[PDB]
Design an enzyme around this catalytic site. Structure first.
Site, PDB file in Angstrom:
ATOM      1  CG  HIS A   1      11.490   6.312  16.374  1.00 10.73           C
ATOM      2  ND1 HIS A   1      10.315   6.747  16.939  1.00 10.73           N
ATOM      3  CD2 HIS A   1      11.289   6.314  15.026  1.00 10.73           C
ATOM      4  CE1 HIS A   1       9.447   7.002  15.970  1.00 10.73           C
ATOM      5  NE2 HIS A   1      10.012   6.729  14.805  1.00 10.73           N
TER       6      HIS A   1
ATOM      7  CB  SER B   1      -0.936  -0.020   1.197  1.00 11.19           C
ATOM      8  OG  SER B   1      -0.182  -0.068   2.429  1.00 11.19           O
TER       9      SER B   1
HETATM   10  C1  HEM Z   1      12.624  10.809  10.725  1.00 11.20           C
HETATM   11  C2  HEM Z   1      12.048   9.409  11.038  1.00 11.20           C
HETATM   12  C3  HEM Z   1      12.689   8.261  10.829  1.00 11.20           C
HETATM   13  C4  HEM Z   1      14.097   8.023  10.190  1.00 11.20           C
HETATM   14  C5  HEM Z   1      15.109   8.930  10.152  1.00 11.20           C
HETATM   15  C6  HEM Z   1      11.819   7.223  11.309  1.00 11.20           C
HETATM   16  C7  HEM Z   1      12.157   5.905  11.258  1.00 11.20           C
HETATM   17  C8  HEM Z   1      11.367   4.887  11.605  1.00 11.20           C
HETATM   18  C9  HEM Z   1      11.791   3.527  11.752  1.00 11.20           C
HETATM   19  C10 HEM Z   1      13.136   3.001  11.173  1.00 11.20           C
HETATM   20  C11 HEM Z   1      10.697   2.849  12.092  1.00 11.20           C
HETATM   21  C12 HEM Z   1      10.551   1.337  12.301  1.00 11.20           C
HETATM   22  C13 HEM Z   1      11.505   0.482  11.856  1.00 11.20           C
HETATM   23  C14 HEM Z   1       9.658   3.804  12.399  1.00 11.20           C
HETATM   24  C15 HEM Z   1       8.426   3.544  12.894  1.00 11.20           C
HETATM   25  C16 HEM Z   1       7.434   4.458  13.166  1.00 11.20           C
HETATM   26  N1  HEM Z   1       7.566   5.845  13.232  1.00 11.20           N
HETATM   27 FE1  HEM Z   1       9.275   6.751  12.620  1.00 11.20          FE
HETATM   28  N2  HEM Z   1      10.648   7.757  11.849  1.00 11.20           N
HETATM   29  C17 HEM Z   1      10.790   9.129  11.720  1.00 11.20           C
HETATM   30  C18 HEM Z   1       9.848  10.048  12.097  1.00 11.20           C
HETATM   31  C19 HEM Z   1       8.582   9.783  12.596  1.00 11.20           C
HETATM   32  C20 HEM Z   1       7.535  10.760  12.912  1.00 11.20           C
HETATM   33  C21 HEM Z   1       7.543  12.274  12.711  1.00 11.20           C
HETATM   34  C22 HEM Z   1       6.491  10.094  13.381  1.00 11.20           C
HETATM   35  C23 HEM Z   1       5.119  10.666  13.782  1.00 11.20           C
HETATM   36  C24 HEM Z   1       5.166  10.698  15.254  1.00 11.20           C
HETATM   37  C25 HEM Z   1       3.835  11.050  15.830  1.00 11.20           C
HETATM   38  O1  HEM Z   1       3.402  10.244  16.700  1.00 11.20           O
HETATM   39  O2  HEM Z   1       3.285  12.133  15.469  1.00 11.20           O
HETATM   40  C26 HEM Z   1       6.862   8.688  13.374  1.00 11.20           C
HETATM   41  C27 HEM Z   1       6.033   7.689  13.743  1.00 11.20           C
HETATM   42  C28 HEM Z   1       6.329   6.367  13.564  1.00 11.20           C
HETATM   43  C29 HEM Z   1       5.334   5.328  13.695  1.00 11.20           C
HETATM   44  C30 HEM Z   1       3.797   5.408  13.940  1.00 11.20           C
HETATM   45  C31 HEM Z   1       3.167   5.385  12.513  1.00 11.20           C
HETATM   46  C32 HEM Z   1       1.630   5.436  12.634  1.00 11.20           C
HETATM   47  O3  HEM Z   1       1.045   4.313  12.777  1.00 11.20           O
HETATM   48  O4  HEM Z   1       0.996   6.561  12.611  1.00 11.20           O
HETATM   49  C33 HEM Z   1       6.072   4.062  13.421  1.00 11.20           C
HETATM   50  C34 HEM Z   1       5.400   2.667  13.415  1.00 11.20           C
HETATM   51  N3  HEM Z   1       8.116   8.537  12.909  1.00 11.20           N
HETATM   52  N4  HEM Z   1      10.098   5.031  12.087  1.00 11.20           N
HETATM   53 CA   LIG Z   2      -0.721  -2.078   4.003  1.00 12.12          CA
END
Ligand code: HEM
Ligand SMILES: [Ca+2]
Ligand SMILES: *[C@@H]1O[C@H](CO)[C@@H](O[C@@H]2O[C@H](CO)[C@@H](O[C@H]3O[C@H](CO)[C@@H](O)[C@H](O)[C@@H]3O)[C@H](O)[C@H]2NC(C)=O)[C@H](O)[C@H]1NC(C)=O
Ligand SMILES: *[C@H]1O[C@H](CO)[C@@H](O[C@@H]2O[C@H](CO)[C@@H](O[C@H]3O[C@H](CO)[C@@H](O)[C@H](O)[C@@H]3O)[C@H](O)[C@H]2NC(C)=O)[C@H](O)[C@H]1NC(C)=O
Ligand SMILES: *[C@@H]1O[C@H](CO)[C@@H](O[C@@H]2O[C@H](CO)[C@@H](O)[C@H](O)[C@H]2NC(C)=O)[C@H](O)[C@H]1NC(C)=O
Ligand SMILES: *[C@@H]1O[C@H](CO)[C@@H](O[C@@H]2O[C@H](CO)[C@@H](O)[C@H](O)[C@H]2NC(C)=O)[C@H](O)[C@H]1NC(C)=O
Length: 595
Positions: free
Chosen positions: A351, A190
Site C-alpha cells: 500500500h 488460483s
Molecule cells: C487499490 C489497491 C491497490 C493498488 C492501487 C492495492 C495494492 C496492493 C498491493 C500492491 C499489495 C501487496 C503488494 C496489496 C496487498 C493487500 N491489500 Fe491492497 N490494494 C488496494 C486496495 C485494497 C483494499 C480495498 C483492500 C481491502 C481492505 C480491507 O481490509 O477491507 C486491500 C487489502 C489488501 C490485502 C488483504 C487481502 C485479504 O487477505 O483479504 C493485501 C494482502 N487492498 N494491495
Molecule cells: Ca492460491
C-alpha cells in the site's frame, strides 16, 4: 488448545489420491490433512487472537475498554496524523519498476482474501451502516476524528463491515473468532483459475476441446484476448462511468478489476494460459480439453512461483531472504502451508508502494495521447479505459517504465488511496485504505506490535526513546506514542511499516520475518511446487528455469522492447532490448512422446 476442528461450511471431497494436478479448491495437496491450505477455511493463527472480550469483539469496540491500560486511537486519526502526506515530489522509487508493486498485489491475491460477511443483500442494514454510522454487529464504522475534513464533507464515518468467520455466519461464542481465507493458500494461480469448482468452470471454454479459458467475445485487443466481462449486477465498473457502461472483468479472483493495472496484470495471465494451451495442442494434438487445461494451468502455476520466488522475494526481502527462505530442500509434508492471519496484514506493505498516477505509453515509451497520465483514483474499477482507450499494451509499458512509490516514514500512503478510495456500493471516491487496514487488524483480533516483535526474536521497545531507536525516527516515534500510548498497543500494519528497510529490501525486519516465514511455508508445504522432484520432468524443469516477466509480456502483447530485469527501475530506450534477445519457454519437453 483443547478442541480439535470445527468448520462446518466446507464439504469434504474424497481426494485426488488420483490427481496429477492440484485441485481447484486446494484440497488434497497434503495427504495426511487434505484440508490444509484449502480455500474457504479459517486463516491460520501464528499467535492467539486478541479481542476485547477475548473472543470476537475488536479492540476499540467498547469505548470504556482499554488495551493494556489505554484507549486505542481511531483508525482514521492514526491515518491523518501519521499515514498521510501532501507532496508527491521526491516520493518515487529510483530502483523499482511499477511492475514491482503490481506483482505484489497479484501474489497477494493468489494467497489470501478475507471477504466481509455477506449477511444482508435484502437488508437495509446493508445500507444502514453507511447512512447512520451505528456500530452494529457486522457493522464497525470508522469514525472521523474532530478535526477531519471528511466530517465537513462525507458525514460522521466511513462504513466498514467485519470480515466473514468460519463455523457460524451468525452468533456463537466459546472459542476465539476466526476469519476465512477464500482462496487457496498455494501459489497456484488460483487468481487465474478461481478457487471454487463453480467459478473454475464458468471461466473455462468447454465449447471447444482445446482446453482454452473463456474469452470475451464482446471486445478485442488487436486480435488479443480480454478477460470475459462479469455477469452481474450491481457493478463497480459500470458505475464509475454509466455512459461507457463497461462491465468489471471476470477472473479466478474477484478483486480483478479493483484497478486497471491489476486487470491488466490479470489480462497477461489469461493470455499465457491460452497461448500455452494452443501450443501444447500443437505438440500434442492427441491430448484432450482437460489435459490441455490442467497442463496449461500447471505450467502457468510454476511460472507464478518462479517469478515470485526467484525474481520478486529477493528484492522484497533483501538481506533477510536467505535468513528465511533458504534455497529449496524439497517438499516437506509436516509444514503448515496455510496463510496466517497476520500475513494478510504484513503483505499490505504494498500500500505504501502505490504511487498517485498511472501512465500509458506508446511504442517509443512516451506519453500515449493527450491525457496519458491519470490519477490512480480514477482507475479504481475502470475497465473502460482499457476496452475503449488503448488495450493493455500502453499500460504494460507504464508498468515497465514508470516507478513505484517508495515507503517513506513521513509519506506513507498516497491520498489517492488514503483519501480517494472508492468502495463498491459506497458511491464516493472518498474512503481511506490506511484507516481500513487499521480497522481490519482490530477486526481480526491481531496481536499488537511488540507481540510480533517478540515473535520475531527482535526487541520490544517500551519507551518513547526505545521506539525512537527502533524506528530510527524521533518524530514518527512521538506521533506513534501520542496516539497509542505505548509500543504494546500499536496496530501491526502500521508499526510494521514504520520501521526502516533492511539492506536491499523494501520492508523492515519485522515484516521480513512475518513475510519470510509465510513464503517459506507456502513453498515448503506445497506438494505441487515446481521444483518438487517428480512434478515436472528433468527437461521441463530446465525449460522452466528461463521464464521472465519480459517473456510473458512479449509472448502476450505487441510490445517488442522490454526490460531484461522487469522489477528494477528501467529507463527506455537504454534498458530496453528486443524481444528476440530473451530466452523463451521452450515447450519441447512437453511432447507426450509415444502414445
Ligand atoms: C487499490 C489497491 C491497490 C493498488 C492501487 C492495492 C495494492 C496492493 C498491493 C500492491 C499489495 C501487496 C503488494 C496489496 C496487498 C493487500 N491489500 Fe491492497 N490494494 C488496494 C486496495 C485494497 C483494499 C480495498 C483492500 C481491502 C481492505 C480491507 O481490509 O477491507 C486491500 C487489502 C489488501 C490485502 C488483504 C487481502 C485479504 O487477505 O483479504 C493485501 C494482502 N487492498 N494491495
Ligand atoms: Ca492460491
Ligand atoms: C465515460 O467514458 C467515455 C468513453 O466511453 C468518455 O467519453 C469519451 O471521452 C472523450 C469525451 O469526453 C472523447 O475522447 C476523444 O475523442 C473525441 C472524438 O474522437 C474528441 O472529440 C474528444 O476531444 C476526445 O479527445 C470520446 O469521444 C468520449 N466518448 C464518448 C462515447 O463520449 C467519458 O469521458 C467517460 N466519462 C467519465 C466521467 O469517465
Ligand atoms: C537496485 O536494483 C537492483 C535489484 O533489482 C539491484 O540489482 C542487484 O543487486 C544485487 C546486490 O548488489 C546483486 O545481486 C546479484 O549479484 C550477483 C553478481 O555475481 C548476481 O549474479 C546474482 O544474480 C545476484 O542476485 C546484483 O549486482 C544486482 N543485479 C544483477 C543483475 O546482478 C541493483 O544493484 C540496485 N542498484 C542500485 C543503484 O541501487
Ligand atoms: C471457445 O473456443 C472456440 C475456439 O477459439 C472459439 O470459437 C472461435 O471464436 C473466434 C472468435 O469468434 C473465431 O476464431 C471463430 O469464430 C471461432 N473459431 C473456432 C475455430 O472455433 C470460441 O469463441 C471460444 N469461446 C469462448 C467463450 O471463449
Ligand atoms: C519438515 O518440517 C518439520 C517442522 O516444520 C521439521 O521437523 C523438525 O525437526 C526438528 C528436529 O531437529 C524438531 O526440533 C522440530 O520438531 C522440527 N523443526 C521445526 C522448525 O518445526 C522437519 O525437519 C522438516 N523436514 C525437512 C527435511 O526440512
Amino acid at each position: 488448545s483443547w478442541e480439535v476442528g470445527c468448520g462446518a461450511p466446507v464439504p469434504l471431497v474424497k481426494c485426488d489420491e488420483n490427481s496429477p494436478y492440484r485441485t481447484i479448491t486446494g484440497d488434497c495437496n497434503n495427504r495426511r490433512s487434505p484440508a490444509l491450505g484449502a480455500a474457504n477455511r479459517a486463516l491460520a493463527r501464528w499467535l492467539p487472537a486478541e479481542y476485547e472480550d477475548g473472543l470476537a469483539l475488536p479492540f476499540g469496540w467498547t469505548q470504556r475498554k482499554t488495551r493494556n491500560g489505554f484507549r486505542v486511537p481511531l483508525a482514521r486519526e492514526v491515518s491523518n496524523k501519521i499515514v498521510g502526506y501532501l507532496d508527491e515530489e521526491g516520493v518515487l522509487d529510483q530502483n523499482r519498476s511499477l511492475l514491482f508493486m503490481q506483482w505484489g498485489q497479484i501474489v497477494d491475491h493468489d494467497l489470501d482474501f478475507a471477504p466481509e460477511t455477506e449477511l444482508g443483500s435484502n437488508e437495509h442494514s446493508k445500507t444502514q451502516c453507511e447512512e447512520y454510522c451505528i456500530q452494529g454487529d457486522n457493522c464497525f464504522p470508522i469514525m472521523f476524528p474532530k478535526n477531519d475534513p471528511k466530517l465537513k464533507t462525507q458525514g460522521k464515518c466511513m462504513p466498514f463491515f467485519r470480515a466473514g468467520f468460519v463455523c457460524p455466519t451468525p452468533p456463537y461464542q466459546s472459542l476465539a473468532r476466526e476469519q476465512i481465507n477464500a482462496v487457496t493458500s498455494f501459489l497456484d494461480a488460483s487468481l487465474v483459475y478461481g478457487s471454487e469448482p463453480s467459478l473454475a468452470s464458468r471461466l473455462r471454454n468447454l465449447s471447444s476441446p482445446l482446453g482454452l479459458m473463456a474469452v470475451n467475445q464482446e471486445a478485442w485487443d488487436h486480435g488479443l484476448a480480454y478477460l470475459p466481462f462479469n455477469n452481474k449486477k450491481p457493478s463497480p465498473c459500470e458505475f464509475i462511468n454509466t455512459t461507457a457502461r463497461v462491465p468489471c472483468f471476470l477472473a479466478g479472483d474477484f478483486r480483478a478489476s479493483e484497478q486497471i493495472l491489476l486487470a491488466t496484470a490479470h489480462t497477461l495471465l489469461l493470455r499465457e494460459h491460452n497461448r500455452l494451451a494452443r501450443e501444447l495442442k500443437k505438440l500434442n494434438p492427441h491430448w484432450n480439453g482437460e489435459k490441455l487445461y490442467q497442463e496449461a494451468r500447471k505450467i502457468l502455476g510454476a511460472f507464478i512461483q518462479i517469478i515470485t520466488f526467484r525474481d520478486y522475494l529477493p528484492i522484497v526481502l533483501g538481506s533477510e531472504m536467505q535468513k528465511w527462505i533458504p534455497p529449496y530442500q524439497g517438499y516437506n509434508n509436516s509444514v503448515d502451508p496455510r496463510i496466517s492471519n497476520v500475513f494478510t496484514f504484513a503483505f499490505r506493505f504494498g500500500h505504501m508502494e502505490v504511487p498517485s498516477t498511472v501512465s500509458r505509453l506508446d511504442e517509443n515509451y512516451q506519453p500515449w495521447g493527450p491525457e496519458a497520465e491519470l490519477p490512480l483514483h480514477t482507475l479504481f474499477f475502470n475497465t473502460w479505459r482499457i476496452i475503449k482507450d488503448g488495450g493493455i499494451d500502453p499500460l504494460v509499458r507504464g508498468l515497465l517504465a514508470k516507478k513505484s512509490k517508495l515507503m517513506n516514514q513521513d509519506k506513507m500512503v498516497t491520498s489517492e488511496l488514503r483519501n480517494k478510495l472508492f468502495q463498491p456500493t459506497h458511491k464516493i471516491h472518498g474512503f481511506d485504505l490506511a484507516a481500513i487496514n487499521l480497522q481490519r487488524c482490530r477486526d481480526h483480533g491481531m496481536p499488537g506490535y511488540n507481540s510480533w516483535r517478540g515473535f520475531c526474536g527482535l526487541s520490544q521497545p517500551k519507551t518513547l526513546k526505545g521506539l525512537q531507536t527502533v524506528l530510527k525516527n524521533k518524530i514518527l516515534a512521538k506521533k506513534l506514542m501520542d496516539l497509542y500510548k505505548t509500543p504494546d498497543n500499536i496496530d501491526i500494519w502500521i508499526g510494521g511499516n514504520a520501521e526502516p528497510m533492511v539492506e536491499r529490501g523494501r520492508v523492515g525486519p519485522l515484516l521480513a520475518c512475518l513475510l519470510g516465514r509465510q513464503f517459506q511455508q507456502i513453498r515448503d508445504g506445497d506438494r505441487f511446487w515446481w521444483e518438487n522432484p517428480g512434478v515436472f520432468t528433468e527437461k521441463q524443469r530446465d525449460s522452466l528455469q528461463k521464464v521472465s516477466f519480459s517473456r510473458l509480456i512479449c509472448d502476450n502483447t505487441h510490445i517488442t522492447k522490454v526490460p531484461l530485469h522487469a522489477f528494477q527501475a528501467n529507463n527506455y530506450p537504454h534498458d530496453f532490448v528486443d524481444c528476440s534477445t530473451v530466452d523463451k519457454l521452450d515447450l519441447s519437453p512437453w511432447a507426450s512422446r509415444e502414445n
